[PDB]
Design an enzyme around this catalytic site. Sequence first.
Site, PDB file in Angstrom:
ATOM      1  N   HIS A  96      13.552  15.543  -9.200  1.00 13.24           N
ATOM      2  CA  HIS A  96      13.886  15.440  -7.783  1.00 13.24           C
ATOM      3  C   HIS A  96      12.689  14.971  -6.959  1.00 13.24           C
ATOM      4  O   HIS A  96      12.692  15.096  -5.731  1.00 13.24           O
ATOM      5  CB  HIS A  96      14.408  16.776  -7.232  1.00 13.24           C
ATOM      6  CG  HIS A  96      15.498  17.392  -8.055  1.00 13.24           C
ATOM      7  ND1 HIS A  96      16.833  17.244  -7.749  1.00 13.24           N
ATOM      8  CD2 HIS A  96      15.452  18.167  -9.164  1.00 13.24           C
ATOM      9  CE1 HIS A  96      17.563  17.894  -8.636  1.00 13.24           C
ATOM     10  NE2 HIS A  96      16.749  18.464  -9.506  1.00 13.24           N
ATOM     11  N   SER A 139     -10.213  -6.850  -2.318  1.00 19.40           N
ATOM     12  CA  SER A 139     -11.281  -6.854  -1.332  1.00 19.40           C
ATOM     13  C   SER A 139     -12.400  -5.904  -1.745  1.00 19.40           C
ATOM     14  O   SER A 139     -12.170  -4.870  -2.378  1.00 19.40           O
ATOM     15  CB  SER A 139     -10.740  -6.455   0.041  1.00 19.40           C
ATOM     16  OG  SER A 139     -11.761  -6.493   1.023  1.00 19.40           O
ATOM     17  N   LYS A 153      -7.666  -0.185  -4.477  1.00 21.18           N
ATOM     18  CA  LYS A 153      -6.366  -0.651  -4.010  1.00 21.18           C
ATOM     19  C   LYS A 153      -5.905  -1.822  -4.868  1.00 21.18           C
ATOM     20  O   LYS A 153      -6.544  -2.880  -4.882  1.00 21.18           O
ATOM     21  CB  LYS A 153      -6.441  -1.052  -2.539  1.00 21.18           C
ATOM     22  CG  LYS A 153      -5.111  -1.498  -1.956  1.00 21.18           C
ATOM     23  CD  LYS A 153      -5.132  -1.486  -0.432  1.00 21.18           C
ATOM     24  CE  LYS A 153      -3.810  -1.978   0.144  1.00 21.18           C
ATOM     25  NZ  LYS A 153      -3.696  -1.723   1.608  1.00 21.18           N
ATOM     26  N   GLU A 183       6.912  -5.706  -8.661  1.00 19.72           N
ATOM     27  CA  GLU A 183       7.754  -6.230  -7.592  1.00 19.72           C
ATOM     28  C   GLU A 183       8.552  -7.436  -8.063  1.00 19.72           C
ATOM     29  O   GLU A 183       9.734  -7.577  -7.726  1.00 19.72           O
ATOM     30  CB  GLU A 183       6.892  -6.582  -6.381  1.00 19.72           C
ATOM     31  CG  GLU A 183       6.259  -5.358  -5.744  1.00 19.72           C
ATOM     32  CD  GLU A 183       5.300  -5.696  -4.622  1.00 19.72           C
ATOM     33  OE1 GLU A 183       5.175  -6.888  -4.271  1.00 19.72           O
ATOM     34  OE2 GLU A 183       4.671  -4.759  -4.089  1.00 19.72           O
TER      35      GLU A 183
END
Lengths: 462, 462, 462, 462
Positions: free
Chosen positions: B187, B317, B323, B330
């Site tokens: 869940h 970057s 990141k 995707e």
Amino acid sequence: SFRIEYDTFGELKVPNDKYYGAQTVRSTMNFKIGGVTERMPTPVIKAFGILKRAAAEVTQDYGLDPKIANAIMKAADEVAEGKLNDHFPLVVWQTGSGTQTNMNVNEVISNRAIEMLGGELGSKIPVHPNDHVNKSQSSNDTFPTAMHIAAAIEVHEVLLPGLQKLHDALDAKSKEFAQIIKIGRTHTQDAVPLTLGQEFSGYVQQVKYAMTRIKAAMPRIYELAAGGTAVGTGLNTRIGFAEKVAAKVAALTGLPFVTAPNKFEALAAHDALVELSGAMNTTACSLMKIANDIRFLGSGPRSGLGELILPENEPGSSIMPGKVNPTQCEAMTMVAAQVMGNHVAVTVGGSNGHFELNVFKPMMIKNVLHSARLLGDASVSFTENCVVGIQANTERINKLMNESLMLVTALNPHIGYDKAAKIAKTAHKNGSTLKETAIELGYLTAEQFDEWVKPKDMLGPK
Amino acid sequence: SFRIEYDTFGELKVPNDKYYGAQTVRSTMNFKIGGVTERMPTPVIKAFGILKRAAAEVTQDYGLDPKIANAIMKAADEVAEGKLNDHFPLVVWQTGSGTQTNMNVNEVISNRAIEMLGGELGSKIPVHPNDHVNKSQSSNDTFPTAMHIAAAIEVHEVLLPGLQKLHDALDAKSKEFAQIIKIGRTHTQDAVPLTLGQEFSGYVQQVKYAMTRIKAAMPRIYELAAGGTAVGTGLNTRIGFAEKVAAKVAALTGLPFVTAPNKFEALAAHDALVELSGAMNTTACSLMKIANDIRFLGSGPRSGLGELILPENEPGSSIMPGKVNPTQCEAMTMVAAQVMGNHVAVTVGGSNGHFELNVFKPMMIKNVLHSARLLGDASVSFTENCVVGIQANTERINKLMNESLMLVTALNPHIGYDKAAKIAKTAHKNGSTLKETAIELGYLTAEQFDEWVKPKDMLGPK
Amino acid sequence: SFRIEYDTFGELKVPNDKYYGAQTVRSTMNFKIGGVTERMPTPVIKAFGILKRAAAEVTQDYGLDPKIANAIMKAADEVAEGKLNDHFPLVVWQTGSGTQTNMNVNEVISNRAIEMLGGELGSKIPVHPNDHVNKSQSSNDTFPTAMHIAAAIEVHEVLLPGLQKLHDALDAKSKEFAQIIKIGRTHTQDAVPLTLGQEFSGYVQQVKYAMTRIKAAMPRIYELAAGGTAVGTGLNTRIGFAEKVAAKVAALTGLPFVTAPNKFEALAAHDALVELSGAMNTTACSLMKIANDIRFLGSGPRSGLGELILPENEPGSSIMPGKVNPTQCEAMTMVAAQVMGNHVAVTVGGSNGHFELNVFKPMMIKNVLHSARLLGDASVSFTENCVVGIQANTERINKLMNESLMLVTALNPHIGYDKAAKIAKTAHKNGSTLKETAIELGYLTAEQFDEWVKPKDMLGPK
Amino acid sequence: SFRIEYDTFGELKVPNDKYYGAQTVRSTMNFKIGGVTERMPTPVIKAFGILKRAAAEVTQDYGLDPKIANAIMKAADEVAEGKLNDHFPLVVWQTGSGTQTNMNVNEVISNRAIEMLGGELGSKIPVHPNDHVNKSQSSNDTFPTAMHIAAAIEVHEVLLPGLQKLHDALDAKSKEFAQIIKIGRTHTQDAVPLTLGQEFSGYVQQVKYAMTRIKAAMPRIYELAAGGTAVGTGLNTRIGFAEKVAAKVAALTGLPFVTAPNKFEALAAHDALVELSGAMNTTACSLMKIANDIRFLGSGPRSGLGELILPENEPGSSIMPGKVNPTQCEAMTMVAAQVMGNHVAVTVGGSNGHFELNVFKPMMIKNVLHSARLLGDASVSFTENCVVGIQANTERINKLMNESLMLVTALNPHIGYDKAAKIAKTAHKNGSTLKETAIELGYLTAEQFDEWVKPKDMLGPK
């Protein structure tokens, strides 16, 4: 010949006759999915041209050198006008934000602008892809902006004009067929009459409503995300930038584009594309009915319905007179089915947004533009190569009117229900007509049948 | 430069460097729907090459001159081998039987064969598009044959090899991560532990089952309609033609092609394509789960889950360490959504057959080949540019294991349920760990916690 | 305990305690598909009661006896009010026109009216099911009318009120959270900040636009087919009946019903239901995003995102402090998926009309009503049992704000990009905060960090 | 008339005449979505009874008291046998894992077993819902097991038996019509002949392959999740439980159930349900084609195709001899459309798993069971009330054979193509038959036409 550019992963050869850069070349290698048929739709590329034009013009107010900004605007115009389509090799199946295409546009516009200013391609001098062409922008808010510019332009130039032509042609045939009475069909069973024009007026209404439905799904397509930057806050841009970019795009396109009242709804979802796709999904249901009807109404020449004579688009054999395949009906109904599948694809992507950013953007706009182009193009083709040339087989229609069992109820007030059922059941048993049967049973004279049984009086309420 | 050819509607200019004829040129004008992205998939064209090769070889037995038949076989091979793709400009959105593409293939093969024999292009001499290249054939049974040849070849060369690579790479990571214990999520709430390898073994199973499901949907793809001619009877062809063509196609391709036991089921419907599309639809559900999981497991670096470190495919970057956008996730999840929409498009077409012939063939095979190519290509891309480079953030995983409230139930047999809930509710209230809380309440020593609470013992039944 | 009724095919036992008659019993024998869960939706039955009430009042102008008309109207009112639901045993999977439910309604109203007049059940005396209750009506134009009445009532009483409650509750939380700053997520990766109120304001916009889209899809739902009779011509009904019964329905319901301006489009297709389903399909995409976001934002307590504390409605375990399964999010996202499937069902039916009559009517309205009910009820349940009680975990949000590497850019104007990046890369490496790191390196003071790093200044344009 | 039960959140009134308890009542208050038509499908409830019966027998090895185990087993048998259906008020739209229905089953079985042991309803004495009925089970691995049991039972008892009846009836008609020659239809245009038996043999093949496809989609339905417990590890269940309960279910049902070899794939996804739904989606395409063909072949009596006389089950009008609405075809084609929509619903849910648990389980099994029930019941109704009674309109078929222009090619070897074409073009022009025309022109004699034009020779290869 090629030039050498670099990204953080290595050096890349860039063809000297290409305006894109290392980031685009890296994208062609990391996203080898589907081939050339999967290239980002040209309408999106052109919409980026418009968008980058509007941005460069607004950021001039924020210091951007006019000599650079004017070169960006000129290069942007060339993209918008379809002069540089060969410099965008990336497929739909990239990042869900469309970052690679935004980079593709930024690289192409800078290198072209650099060329206009006498600089060296690939150098970022004097026009820098990010600091100048992408100034005050983000892939997250520019790609949605390009999606809605492209969809609006496609709707108004391809989809709606195509449906309008089909509407007008169907309306002409409805009027042309206003006096041709035929047998209606409910459950595919013989039913009471109506005019071929009345039946076509129904198709006219469906296409009229299709255009109303598409228009009713456009108000939120006109909302542009430009100005939300990375997460919708508008961080790292100036107050009024969002409104000025939208007003500039509206002026450049002639369409009532506006800035999205809520940039978080504009980045985190694309429910407007789902809405527009749903209107095209309805249109597809309408056109499936219209095309399939005309398909079956033209079936024959002898073992079908044979009410319509469709124009020939394939070579007709000399030994097969009257046989005409409804080719355009088949193209249109295949397009309708495709739109229905595309809509589900749009629906899945539109439902899977995550927090601040929906990362299904390229596939959603691809399916939307695909459906709009197919429906518009198919409407034109279906009109010019089928509808305008439809003729009524009046001889066969009138023959089946005299041979139909449906008109027997017109005798009810003259010889009684029970005597009418006898004529019906007898002609059905014997395979003859109602008039030949009614006479041979002595229920009425031939001149009474012609006076009592009038289909022209069975076409409305009393 | 151009040559002049004629059809029943007028004269047409045919480019001299093109092998197609008047019928193809007429089709480009009567079916202007969608643009170049809508061209008939090359796999269908190549499959026609194989098919026309097999037919010409069999009709030799029925009189066809060997000098002509051998030229047809040579030209057919060039089509099959992808040497003549530039001579097929027709879109999917043609007649529902694929007649125009069959004519396109017949024109290209004859003109090429004519050239091989020193004849004049456009003359039908000595190789006639219909009497020789289309001998004993019909669009109604050849296009379905081409559909199934193309689908089988695409499945075995693109789809399954791509899934196999993804399977092997996921299996390698499952073994690599077999010892990394982490907190499960049900869940989306914290749950009892399992190894990162166990979680990945589930992805492995899904991909393994995906391949089994695709294979289980192939037996009826191997059935070929060739031999049913116009309505499935086999009128105007020789006994044994159907079996010999299928055996020839099987020999040419190396795949177990057979003739359809019932040619009426083979012409009137394409339920095998619906079946195959449904298996790819299941595959898309599996890959959507796998990709989205990996997407969220790699979320971070600090405000997400941060269990996985995905490879960089975009420039990272310097001021944004850690990141990494899950770009391949995707692309894969967009492909999955597209497959789901394509399947609905296949379903609508497969359901709308009429009597002896389903006339949605081009759009059904387009969507099938589209899905197969995208899933195969995306599987390779997702493997090479993401999966093989996934690393576990063991430091963060182990930190959240010590900070989790889920392991408190290991203390039940030692200090009692009620005393365990006190440690839990207290650490939750205070925001500290279970060990720091259990000690400060005096329920146990640090050395008892390390001995009693062992996640390695919480990974199976007892 | 039965009575004996007769149709043309013989004897049928009808339960004495039921108001339906022989035709209904006949329909129950030939259409045993699915069971009781497949019974015609109650809103359709109630809508029939409204329609028959309206027709009975209007047909008094055609000689219908007032004493009988009054009894028909009273019995029709009981049907509309949900008082005779146990007398409708027919399933959705019946005649595609809904004729048998029309007969079900005619028999129930006739027998109930007979009872009110002291007659014998099943005698058709004094109230005849077809001559009186079905007066001036057809077996083809009544069901389309009923399902548009039902669709409109369900939209205005269930769907929009439910969405309005959800909109209002989300808006209240957007304001309650207007000052709680959190880390944004793009691609699920850490991103620049935004407030929970800003994020929630996007959800609010989505629901507001959903209600707008649903209302924009209603104008053609208000068009009623009543009066088109068998094929749309209005044969065998009276001039003015169409406009009068529609105005009577409008007055009885307070909804802007009007007669359909083209009865052929109204009987041959149900594009309006497809349009309305499409609006609910867009709504489902919006609710999927909202519910799934709140699902993950409440994930935890410690191995998730943990930004939101959702209300606990079901039983927890005292040993599991903090674990709350987002069960209302699951019911909502399951409903959303169902609506999407329902829409394809509606789309397939709407596309398959045949000439004068689309005979997919029962399954089309069933899915429309199903989606509208689920969306409306789920929006209320999600609102009352989750949204209104959502709390922000401000302590954890503040902790994750301080531990984020995203705010490092605020230091650029003060120590330069080069130095800020050095802090981020070090904090990321050591697993410490930006503040701690920037101090150990000696690039600034603790008081300097607090003055320069203000997330409140990173929430919009400047 | 109520009793008072207690959960951690307070007091709840439970009807004295119900076997469910406080948790069930709690669930009814928080999930009021949809109403009674949305109650959990009965096959899922019965499957739970089988599962709880199996677990109770196996857990005696773990110390479960035989006297209690025997009562649990007897109460579980009553649930499996459909005797306690009124004690399950929960809707599909609940927790995505189905936990609350699991608790519903635990409470009903516990209270019924208590009753059999002379205890007090609601006391948990001597039968505890969780410690005894849910022994060695999790709230996550029981519902997936139950829905696979339900899916398998419904396939073998409802779906396949229904398809088998339809296959057999179509096959019998294929043989009864093996000599009736009719005009084929391609693109709906007249085509070369085929027999009704040949056309029907295609339908037979489609149903045969449908059953094969459904059976091919079952192997992974037989895999049961029981034993994976919370996240798939099997934590807190006993070694051997998984294999033992599955074998007990197999013995209780006579179906080849086995434990899932990867419990993580089994809990995190339900690709097997998507696979099975896909098989039923292919079946729906087949049944749409069959039902729609028979629909149009029975169209008429005079303005349609009129090849088939379908049984009349509902009331005709004596004044309408020959008019039979194909109502069974409409119920079937509506069901087919519903299955297609149901499949998208299943697809969306199956695609949206999250880490260790897919929480779309109730809606996924609901749509699978819905499609299986409708397909099975519709196949029986379509068989018994239409197919078995179909008659060929041989008189009309013969008339249309003689009036067809298609057979004109048989005259080519006897009078040459040039002369045959002259006959066809003249017959088409004058609206007469080939025989009549060929005689007036004097190209042959009546006895010559009958000897040369033999449709019996145009039904296969030579």
